[PDB]
Amino acid sequence: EDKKQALLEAATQAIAQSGIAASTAVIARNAGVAEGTLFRYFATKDELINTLYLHLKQDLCQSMIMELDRSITDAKMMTRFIWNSYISWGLNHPARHRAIRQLAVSEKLTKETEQRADDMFPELRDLCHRSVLMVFMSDEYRAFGDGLFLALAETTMDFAARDPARAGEYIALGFEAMWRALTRE
Amino acid sequence: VARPKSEDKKQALLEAATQAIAQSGIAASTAVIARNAGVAEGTLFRYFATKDELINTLYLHLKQDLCQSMIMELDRSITDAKMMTRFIWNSYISWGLNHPARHRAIRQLAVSEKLTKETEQRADDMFPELRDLCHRSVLMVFMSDEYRAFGDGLFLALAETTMDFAARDPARAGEYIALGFEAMWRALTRE
Structure with missing residues (x-):
């Protein structure tokens, strides 16, 4: 503090x-x-990058967990809730979304950090290992996968923020597009 | 009259x-x-x-630049819609890598609530092969007038990320471009 x-x-x-x-x-x-x-x-600078990443991921997760419906179990509806909550967090905190987008695709994140990040929201982490295309989980392309997610979420946020009346439609469309791009058939 | 001071x-x-x-x-x-x-x-x-007129003129200027670059390289002997689209992707990526400022400007213009329908039409008409490909392969929703801009937006967001990673990690560029294409294909096209 x-x-x-x-x-x-x-x-x-x-x-x-x-x-x-x-x-x-x-x-x-x-x-x-x-x-x-x-x-x-x-x-070090790298330690700040790692600490700040964990701090932002924790703040993001905090918002998702409070309204998480642990009944739902199919991968598509759960991913949907995570996506909608991410969108809401980013519209609430545009700077935190912009920072986390730079941090996430940073090759400066350590293995311990990623581990720590994934288990802040264990169920979300379980969902990825089972739902996300293996490629976007590989230690080689997980960052790229994250980058594509964040890019499609940012566009969705941009359209929703300037047209709040149709925000719901943008958010749904962005999600289906995201789901097709990053998950398995 | 004296000689004009400048062009x-x-x-x-x-x-x-x-x-x-x-x-x-x-x-x-x-x-x-x-x-x-x-x-x-x-x-x-x-x-x-107006600023509005500049937005529209610049978008067409930038789209014309991009299209010229793709049209030259084009292989009209390719009928396969996915291989055709992969050409457009690779061309777009390559143009964006070579002109990062132009890709960034086009991306801001493309989603501007200020671009007109007429501007959209002239831009599409610059590359008829690409226009006709989009009409048949892009999901219907993303070709509608209500979500056309949003479809361009998502495409550009995936193209931007792809360039980002290919530019930062130029050794795995080929893989980033291919993976980003398959992601884009899945996101925006029919099956």
């Missing part, structure tokens, strides 16, 4: 605006702390 | 508009654009009475 949280938040805004390349100087100033302070909460 | 600056306006729209988005200022092109905001408007 407080000072570490201020840094996380400053990092979110800087990464969302300037991409994964954002400098700790900007981050630190924006947080209201000297850069030497930043480097005692987060040893 | 028509339309091309220079179109170029500066491409770069500003690609950098700041469709919300780019005409004032910034005119200054980048080396002209008063007033002479911008002598060429484009």
Whole structure:
């Protein structure tokens, strides 16, 4: 919390605006702390990237879990709920979505981080191993798979945010498109 | 009359508009654009009475550039709709990699609520083979007038991600392009 949280938040805004390349100087100033302070909460830049990824994924997951209907079991309806909740989170927090999009496809995420991320929402993780095309689960292309998901979700968000009355239609269409692209027949 | 001090600056306006729209988005200022092109905001408007007119002209300018590039490489001997579409994808990707700013500007323009039906038609008519392919292979919903822009949007989002990864990890470029194509094919076409 407080000072570490201020840094996380400053990092979110800087990464969302300037991409994964954002400098700790900007981050630190924006947080209201000297850069030497930043480097005692987060040893390296990569550690910040990993910590911030986990922090954003936790915040995303928090929103999904509160309204998750654990009755439903078929892969298509569950993926649907995750998608709708992702869309809602991103429309609520455009910067957090933009940061997480840069972070997710970053080759800087460690194996431990991904592991940790997947088990914040165990059922969601179970769904991916069973539903997502194997390719988009391979340690080689999982990032690409994530990137395509996030790209289709961002377009959906963009159309829904500018036309709230038809948001429901955009969101449904985006989902069917996403489902066809990334899951198995 | 004396000799005009300089040539028509339309091309220079179109170029500066491409770069500003690609950098700041469709919300780019005409004032910034005119200054980048080396002209008063007033002479911008002598060429484009409105920002709306600029959006439409630039989109057609950019689509014409893209289409020219694809038409040359085209192989009309291919009848298979999926192999045909894979050509368009590879061509589009290759153009976007070679002109990242143009792909980014086109992507902002394509989804603009400001593009007109008429602009859409002229752009489609630039490449009849591609237009006719879309009419028969793109899912009906994404060819409708209500969701046409949304269909372009998703296609561009998958094309952008593909270029992103191919540009950052140029050694696996071929695989990213192929996988992104199969993703796009599944998302937007019939079966």
